[model samples]
Target: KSPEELKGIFEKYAAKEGDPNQLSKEELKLLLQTEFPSLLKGMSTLDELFEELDKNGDGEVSFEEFQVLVKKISQ
Candidate 1:
């Protein structure tokens, strides 16, 4: 899918409250398991990666936060 399509998918499942700039851990997991399962499947430390992305210790990663993640991982 295209970037915009991916972004839309990400936004659709982001946390309903808090920051709005990122996604909660649960949301991220759902997105991965549902929207990007293939990418998630090979990762042995998906949970660790999730924890690392939740920068604020709030258990969520905002759009900007996730964007950074996507950029790095995609590269």
Candidate 2:
């Protein structure tokens, strides 16, 4: 899918907590579990995948970093 649709998904979930522009670990988990369960099955665990996506290690994932998954998915 296009990044625009992905952006809306990001906004919807990220807005669930403190920062509307960022996704906390819990938010990311919800998204993956609901929208990409198969994606997790391929990974060792959600925590590890989230940690890898959280490029700056700031405890939340910005849309920029989340693009890594989109890149893989689009492939």
Candidate 3:
């Protein structure tokens, strides 16, 4: 799927919980498992990466922050 398509997927999962504009840790796990399984290949837990992804340390990852993973996959 295109990056744009991924954005929609991000929103889909992010909206599954509390904040529709942010992805909680659970949301991140669900998203990676269902949409980006490859990301969890070696990482048994999402916490480690989640910390990195939650750049602002807000405990939730925003779409702008989530794009880093997309960039990683594309590259």
Candidate 4:
């Protein structure tokens, strides 16, 4: 799907949680599993990645933050 066409992707999952604008780790996980499929060979790098990924640390990941996946997949 075109990147610009992906808001529904985020919106769909985001809404699954009770917030239509963000994702719980669970939502992000689903997003990752469904969208990227083979993404993340290993998270052995540990916390700093999640800390970095959850830079905002609101206990939820904003779309602003979820771009980390975009960068990761493109890598």
Residue-level lDDT tens digits of model 3 in 1-75: 776777788888888865656888888888888777888885635886688788784577877777777777778
Clashing pairs in 4: none
Which window of 10 residues has the lowest lDDT sum in candidate 4?
40-49
What lDDT would candidate 4 get against the real structure?
0.65
Name the 10 consecutive residues with the lowest summed lDDT in model 3.
Answer: 41-50
TM-score for each of the candidates: 0.71, 0.81, 0.79, 0.67
Candidate 1 vs candidate 4: the lDDT winner is: 1
User: What ranges in model 1 sit over 4 Å off?
Assistant: 15-19, 42-44
lDDT of candidate 2 over 1-75, digit per residue (tens): 466766798889988865767887888888888778788897536888778877784676767777778778777
Segments in model 4 whose C-alpha atoms lie over 4 Å from true places: 42-50, 72-75
> Pairs clashing in candidate 1?
21-62, 21-63, 22-61, 22-62, 22-63, 23-61, 23-62
lDDT of 1 at 64: 76
Q: What tens-digit string does per-residue lDDT give for candidate 4 at 1-75?
A: 677657789878888985777766666677766775455345523243345567764666667676776666556
How many clashes in candidate 1?
7
Q: State the lDDT of candidate 1 residue by residue for 5-50, as single tens digits.
A: 7877787776364545667667777777776676576552467657
